[PDB]
């Protein structure tokens with residue numbers, strides 16, 4: 103990666119501006135709903151400008167431009183922006199078909215940008231690098247990170263996987279790639295300490311984390327990945343005559359937290375945020391109470 107000096111950061115700004123203009127095409131009919139690329143990219147520009155304002159002399163800019171996380175961040179922001187641009191150039195009119203694979207790929211990129219914004223705000227809070235001081239929520243997960251990586255803010259996927267393998271083995275390439283897509287929110291082949299904190303919060307406890315991840319995010323019909331509150335209500339409408347139908351999902355606005363949606367006996371659709379217990383225990387309890395019976399409306403309800 104190149105040094106993340108001012109010129110390189112400004113080059114990234116110009117690419118992000120082109121993505122914004124591409125996404126303002128009136129034929130796109132883009133809905134103001136998270137992740138909303140037309141808010142995320144300006145917000146990213148604003149936070150990057152804040153960072154530069156905190157590193158406002160030659161020696162400070164030197165430190166910033168050679169910070170390993172920041173160099174990787176800017177390189178990855180530039181690559182995803184070029185990808186977005188290329189998507190429009192190759193998609194042509196297919197970009198305006200709402201359910202085309204091209205538009206689906208735009209939605210994927212909008213999610214990636216949303217995650218990248220959350221990451222940079224977590225690592226440079228108020229524009230100052232704090233990655234070496236980042237506090238991992240789960241103490242046992244924190245001990246793994248510190249043992250193998252110390253105060254590092256970011257690690258290549260290959261290195262991360264090799265260390266994780268020492269604690270939880272992974273033999274399947276399919277499993278490894280699925281795990282990478284869960285952990286590596288920014289899809290840049292690096293695991294940040296922020297991405298590690300989100301993963302270990304969601305799939306706690308740490309001692310069984312691969313089992314928990316498999317049970318919830320791999321082999322569970324109820325798992326819907328990232329959805330908005332409105333999208334949960336809309337998807338569960340078709341199950342409104344099957345009380346006990348339920349799904350669980352992630353919020354791109356509040357990373358690291360699960361939400362559940364279910365159909366009541368009356369046919370109403372309710373949503374709830376489980377607290378102070380791992381999701382799989384909240385599903386166990388909700389099933390034994392008769393609320394969570396049919397994940398995605400299906401008749402097979404996994405048991406843990």
Ligand SMILES: COc1ccc2c(c1CC(=O)O)Oc1c(ccc(OC)c1CC(=O)N1[C@H](c3cc([N+](=O)[O-])cc(OC)c3OCC(=O)O)N(C)C(=O)[C@@H]1C)C2(C)C
Pocket residue numbers: 330331351352353354355356359360361362373374375
């Ligand atoms: C993984 O997801 C999480 C995780 C944590 C939170 C979440 C969400 C929802 C999201 O991110 O999707 O959300 C908020 C939170 C803190 C503040 C906050 O905003 C200022 C919210 C947003 C909120 O409460 N919503 C309520 C809403 C949403 C849900 N539900 O998604 O499960 C349940 C609700 O109550 C049971 C609820 O409140 C409406 C009501 O009670 O009638 N309704 C309608 C809305 O339209 C929004 C979405 C916390 C608590 C930190």
Ligand SMILES: [Ca+2]
Pocket residue numbers: 286287288289290291292293294297
């Ligand atoms: Ca990443």
Ligand SMILES: [Mg+2]
Pocket residue numbers: 144145148
């Ligand atoms: Mg803003």
